[PDB]
Amino acid sequence: KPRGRPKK
DNA sequence: CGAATTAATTCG
């Protein structure tokens, strides 16, 4: 995935 | 594993 918390 | 990053959740 990309950096940081995944978008929901 | 930690900081960094990024978004979700909480709570006024």
Place this chain on the structure above:
DNA sequence: CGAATTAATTCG
């Protein structure tokens, strides 16, 4: 609905 807090994820 926003700022503060919390959480999930990558990279070194």
